[PDB]
C-alpha cells in the first residue's frame, strides 16, 4: 500500500526462536477467535491505514502500532515463543487506541468492550502445561 504508512509489524522471521505452547493454542482458538468475531472488531482486524483515514500524524502519535490482524497471522504462524508475547500485543493494541483517540469517542467504548472480553479470557488462561 502506500508510502505514507509504515511497514506493518513483522509476522515471519527465521532468526526468532518459536515454540507452541498449550497457553498459546487457548490465545488463537479461544481469545482471538473470540474477540475477532466481535461486533466491534472490524476497526481492529488490519493495521490502522492512516492515509484512507485522512489522519497524517497517526503514526506520528503511534509508534508501536499493532492490530488483531497482525496478532492472528502471528499466532497462525507460530510466531510467539510465549503467551506474554501475544497478550502483550493485544495491550499495545488497545493502548495506542486509548492513546490516540478521546475519552468520549466511539472507537474507544469499542476497544473498551473488546477489552474487558479480552480480561475475561486471560483470566480463564490455563497454567502452561
Ligand atoms: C489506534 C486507533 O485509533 N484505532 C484502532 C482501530 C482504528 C482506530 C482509529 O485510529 N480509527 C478509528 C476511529 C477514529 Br478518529
Known amino acids: 500500500g502506500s508510502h505514507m504508512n509504515p511497514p506493518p509489524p513483522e509476522t515471519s522471521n527465521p532468526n526468532k526462536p518459536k515454540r507452541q505452547t498449550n ?3 487457548y490465545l488463537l482458538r479461544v481469545v482471538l477467535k473470540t474477540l475477532w468475531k466481535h ?19 497517526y503514526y506520528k502519535i503511534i509508534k508501536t502500532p499493532m492490530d ?5 497471522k502471528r499466532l497462525e504462524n507460530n510466531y ?3 503467551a506474554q508475547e501475544c497478550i502483550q500485543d493485544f495491550n499495545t493494541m488497545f493502548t495506542n487506541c486509548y492513546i490516540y483517540n478521546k475519552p468520549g469517542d466511539d472507537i474507544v467504548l ?7 472480553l479480552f480480561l475475561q479470557k486471560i483470566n480463564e488462561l490455563p497454567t502452561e502445561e
Open 23 to 25: 497457553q498459546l493454542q
Open 39 to 57: 461486533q466491534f472488531a472490524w476497526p481492529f482486524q488490519q493495521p490502522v491505514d492512516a492515509v484512507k483515514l485522512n489522519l497524517p500524524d
Open 68 to 72: 488483531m490482524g497482525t496478532i492472528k
Open 80 to 82: 510467539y515463543w510465549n
Open 110 to 116: 469499542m476497544a473498551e468492550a473488546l477489552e474487558k
